[PDB]
Write a protein that binds this ligand. Structure first.
Ligand SMILES: *C/C=C(C)/C=C/C=C(C)/C=C/C1=C(C)CCCC1(C)C
Ligand SMILES: *C/C=C(C)/C=C/C=C(C)/C=C/C1=C(C)CCCC1(C)C
Ligand SMILES: *C/C=C(C)/C=C/C=C(C)/C=C/C1=C(C)CCCC1(C)C
Ligand SMILES: *C/C=C(C)/C=C/C=C(C)/C=C/C1=C(C)CCCC1(C)C
Ligand SMILES: *C/C=C(C)/C=C/C=C(C)/C=C/C1=C(C)CCCC1(C)C
Ligand SMILES: CCCCCCCC/C=C/CCCCCCCC(=O)O
Ligand SMILES: CCCCCCCCCCCCCCCCCCCC
Ligand SMILES: CCCCCCCCCCCCCCCCCCCC
Ligand SMILES: CCCCCCCCCCCCCCCCCCCC
Ligand SMILES: CCCCCCCCCCCCCCCCCCCC
Ligand SMILES: CCCCCCCCCCCCCCCCCCCC
Ligand SMILES: CCCCCCCCCCCCCCCCCCCC
Lengths: 287, 288, 287, 286, 288
């Protein structure tokens, strides 16, 4: 065994305060994000609404998930004057984050595929692969780090990490393929946005696997702190940063459909205070 | 004697897996509930019953799973790598029955809502399905959780059979209603309705099977299998089925628009393929 | 006979499970009802919106009320070798239901009067009498069964029950009068619906007074169970059963106003998959 | 010297009655809040401040009463003598002050919103009313709860007088604003506004009276009367008044439609009598 | 350690009551604010919607944040013969407020920048600086007062306060520059409102740094009380005061766009009972 479980390390009063600060800040940031997303939901045409439902869905999940994480943190540690001594429920803090990713990540895939130009079965087939792959990716990590031998088996820890990486590649390929296939059909402005969004999500993903293997280089209050805080910053940056991108795309693509005269939108669409489309009503219909 | 599943002690790994699936399920429903709500006006007033039912069931399922999670957290006590069941462990299974009692009946209405059944034929069908589905679950609750604290092998089987009677009544009514509708619906609508019906009716089989597992003995592993399986089942059927009935409602809504029977204020899409165009009702000048 | 308070009887593990099952199922059913009512709120014209606001209001109340009832139930009994022994808080279970009715019943009256053709003062006067009568009816029952001598006084139990019945008649008369007076002015189809709705509510009401006097025929775990479960079934059946009816009415009356050309509705109105009215927009106005 | 009401022991009957009214009140507010929200688009954009204020106050009142209920459940302990007050019993009365501090000010804005006050005259009035009403409650809190745990009879009376000063300032500003508006409004609108103002301003008298009751001694019965009365008062004034200001907003909205000053997308009704017909804004080219 | 942590001072029953009163009042005021903001969300054109989303976002955060603060306060002190004695969790009361500011303040910046006329890159770049600066400003303060040596290092308390002030100036400059640059393009009425809003936010901000250094003048139940109440009044006044202003702006700017014939709004826009714009519908379009 070379695996030093992070929920075994004792935390300083300062460390305990920092972890709580970032966790709650994150949760609040998501509530702010969720509120924004909801209010700016009708800025997108019915065609790209899947992008909105997915985003709002993930933010909702992330929000609640982080509430559990916070609770586990508060009920997972005891003050001993030598710092904060882990309980039997401290493991739940790490466990809870996996639960979040299991649901949050799959929704992120659909969100990206939603703004992609994939049509008919090609689209439906891609989603199924991505969702299943992303879900499996996280589950495999959960099995190795938490489930198997209480995450103390160095063999399993590494084995399932590799199995997970397999799924990670499957996901990256399907998404990259779908983005690259769509880019040609999109306008230059839309093409750029989609690419930007894809990069933010796919690129960020790398941080998670790296943090997973840190426990191998030993255990410590500081390390445990780094692991938790980093993952929090990662979750907030990716989820919020990426979400804003997919939205701007949906709007651009919506405005384009309006200008092209393919569809109509009941309000004017703006981006950085630059009008993209004008308000329009459908034609009155007789029966 | 029936080996009650809430009597079996669970490993730290088993306890973690059950929690993982339960919470994931609840979160999945939140995601589902949110989507359903946002995509509620993608359907005409005619098939709104399908939306209200779906959102209703997801809402119920969501809250129900919160209770299940709570019961699970208060149902077991940690004994150094093992989780020993307490008096409240039974509530975990009990809570799921409460969920089904309300969730299943709504699923029936949701299916019947997208069906072409008209007038009394429709209203009569719903009543039978709802009552049957509710009874089906209640019977199971009595046999497994209520009667002799779920330790009576005779009752466990008796009420299971009584339940199966109701299960057949439900399957028949729904299958007949779907079969009757399919002919009047378009090919695209026909396919979707059939697909939706299969997902619900087919999945249902899993529940009765898992019910009788406790007869083949008791164990931490078995108890784990029972819980996880039911969770996966609930999520897959409820979200799988729900997604289908929605796609139907939209298709049927778009058709009514194209046919010029009604109008919708926004364009309707399915897999990024336009089904109907945005249209406004004609302005009318009242006597004034 | 003499009054045997139901919160004094010890309950079996089976009885305890049954009561919890029905209580939670009821609360969830209300959530389902509340959600439906809210989503199907714009299926009714502004004229009959009082019917919707009242329904949603009562369902909201019922929902929260049942949450308290459930809490009281969980804190009302203690698990022993003899089953579930009642504590000091067991009385709160029954008390809470009265609180529910005090608010829920009055709203039901307004809901019925809302779909009635009562105009001007005749309408406003009726509401005041019904609300005050219904509120008093429940309050009187609360005083006799719970408040006065801790519900151990057989005399009060009966006296206030009679006083309550007086109010019950006052309410039934006002409502019946209003329904009978309206029926003539409405269409045959609307006439039938209103009558049906009135019957469902007024008829069900009888169950409550009957269950009130059961404690006189003695006390027992089984009886206590019957009292609770029956009232739960009653609440759910009446509240959802009646509500669905008054809604169907509001829609029919709304569709009629549209067909008659008295008003316009922005969406088509349906009943059992039969179109009642077509979608229409108001005429554009220059100011 | 002042017989604090949270010192008196309560009977099982008294305890049950207080709980009954508290919860009923909270539920009534939920019912009110729901209605207010659903009937929010029955009013023109011009008088929307009246709606936002009402929904705001009902929301506050609702949550406030939840705390009051919690405080009540943790404020008394069941004994052989009935329900004995603990250290947290004071919080029950304290919580109500918190409610009023926020609820009352919103009620003023709600009334001023349906008033015809224009420009600075309007903005100035609201500020005075809000600040006065907030101070009024704060002063009462200081005398009855904060200062010597409400045991100083001098302060109890002093701050009550200081509060009454603010109470007069508020009543004057509101009455002036209502009187100034009445002339510009229709007879039907005039009557409603007056009715609404009376319900709020008149009811207000009950609160100061109940405040000074503790001076005439302490008792389980008195304590019960104080709590229940204030609850009935809160419910009656808040829902009674609110319903009135709403009816006004609608009438004033319908008038603007008929007068051809604005347009509303749905027909407006009052007691089943059509006030305005549905109208759509004219489609405009840019 | 010339720093006298405020969570070390014991509080009187009167002090304890006053703190609770203001905290809850604040939270309720935000609920009232949040409700208003939500209902009056469609009083603004799509162009200035960022101003609404930001405000509703901050009010939502502030609301929840104050709930935690209230909880921390209830679990932070224990009632004794000497009054209310601070426990280990008393520090959390102050800690929680920092969490609030960390999220609330940044959103306030975006809210102001949203009503500003900044276009293209200049606008996007400004937001990034403001958000990062404001977030850092609060984080730095948190490090000095709470994180470092449990807030006992007098040197750090001052050092990080200075580092924070640096960020405070960076933020004030960016915002002031953006407001000054916009003023010229806006109408006189709009110009005045924007200026008023900016003043309320930027001016109020000064109170926070001042209250931060009060613990240096010693410790007291009274001092601790003053610090908490003042910050609460500050939060409520700035957040509601400023928010109301930025809203009035968004409406004026929306009405202007309508009058100028640049866009259309489906309802009439009013300010203090004075009509600014009339209701207008987009022109019906026949698609190809
Ligand atoms: C919003 C949160 C996101 C997108 C989280 C993403 C997490 C991953 C991409 C994790 C991947 C992993 C591996 C590829 C190997 C190690 C185990 C995982 C699950 C951390
Ligand atoms: C979303 C949850 C669903 C659809 C649950 C369905 C459950 C059943 C179909 C259960 C059926 C049963 C029998 C037919 C026999 C034994 C008892 C039951 C209730 C498990
Ligand atoms: C939704 C709940 C409803 C409609 C409850 C209704 C309750 C009654 C009609 C109760 C009537 C009573 C009497 C007439 C006599 C005894 C006391 C009462 C309150 C149970
Ligand atoms: C909905 C609740 C309302 C309107 C509460 C109103 C309360 C008052 C008008 C209180 C006034 C008081 C005085 C004028 C003197 C004594 C102290 C007060 C605060 C009770
Ligand atoms: C709604 C809450 C607001 C606007 C809070 C603002 C807080 C500050 C502007 C704090 C500034 C500080 C410094 C510049 C120095 C000392 C540390 C701080 C964080 C209090
Ligand atoms: C909307 C704000 C909610 C705040 C969280 C409330 C959680 C439950 C607490 C209830 C309060 C209990 C009674 C009042 C205590 C007052 C203590 C004091 O005197 O300082
Ligand atoms: C792998 C588990 C994650 C499930 C998320 C699926 C999203 C739910 C949306 C479906 C709508 C019905
Ligand atoms: C449907 C998934 C079922 C999984 C059961 C897992 C069993 C637990 C392993 C330990 C024995
Ligand atoms: C019905 C909803 C109730 C919510 C209660 C929230 C506060 C609970 C405080 C409990 C303190 C022991
Ligand atoms: C929707 C009804 C849920 C009621 C919850 C009551 C508390 C149960 C234990 C947690
Ligand atoms: C098992 C003893 C209790 C059974 C009583 C249940 C009565 C139900 C009545 C519903 C109508
Ligand atoms: C049991 C004695 C106390 C009853 C007081 C009732 C007061 C009600 C006031 C209504 C206004």
């Amino acid at each position: 065994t070379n695996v030093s479980v992070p929920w075994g390390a004792t935390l300083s009063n300062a460390e305990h305060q920092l972890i709580f600060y970032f966790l709650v800040v994150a949760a609040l940031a998501f509530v702010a994000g969720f509120i924004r997303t909801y209010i700016t939901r009708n800025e997108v045409g019915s065609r790209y609404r899947t992008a909105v439902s997915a985003r709002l869905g993930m933010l909702g999940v992330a929000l609640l998930a982080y509430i559990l994480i916070i609770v586990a943190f508060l009920l997972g540690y005891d003050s001993t004057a030598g710092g904060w001594v882990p309980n039997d429920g401290a493991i739940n803090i790490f466990s809870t984050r996996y639960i979040e990713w299991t649901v949050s990540v799959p929704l992120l895939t659909i969100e990206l595929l939603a703004v992609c130009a994939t049509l008919g079965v090609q689209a439906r087939r891609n989603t199924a692969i991505a969702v299943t792959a992303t879900g499996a990716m996280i589950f495999c990590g959960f099995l190795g780090a938490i489930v198997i031998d209480n995450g103390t088996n160095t063999g399993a820890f590494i084995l399932w990490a590799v199995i997970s990486c397999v799924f990670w590649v499957i996901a990256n390929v399907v998404l990259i393929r779908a983005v690259r296939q769509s880019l040609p059909t999109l306008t230059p402005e839309s093409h750029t946005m989609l690419k930007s969004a894809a990069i933010v999500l796919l690129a960020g993903w790398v941080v998670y696997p790296i943090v997973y293997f840190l426990p191998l280089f030993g255990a410590s209050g500081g390390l445990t702190t780094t692991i938790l805080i980093t993952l929090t910053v990662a979750d907030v940056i990716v989820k919020l940063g990426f979400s804003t991108q997919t939205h701007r795309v949906a709007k651009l693509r919506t405005a384009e459909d309006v200008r092209a005269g393919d569809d109509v939108h009941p309000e004017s669409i703006w981006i950085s205070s630059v009008k993209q489309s004008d308000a329009g009503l459908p034609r009155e219909v007789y029966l």
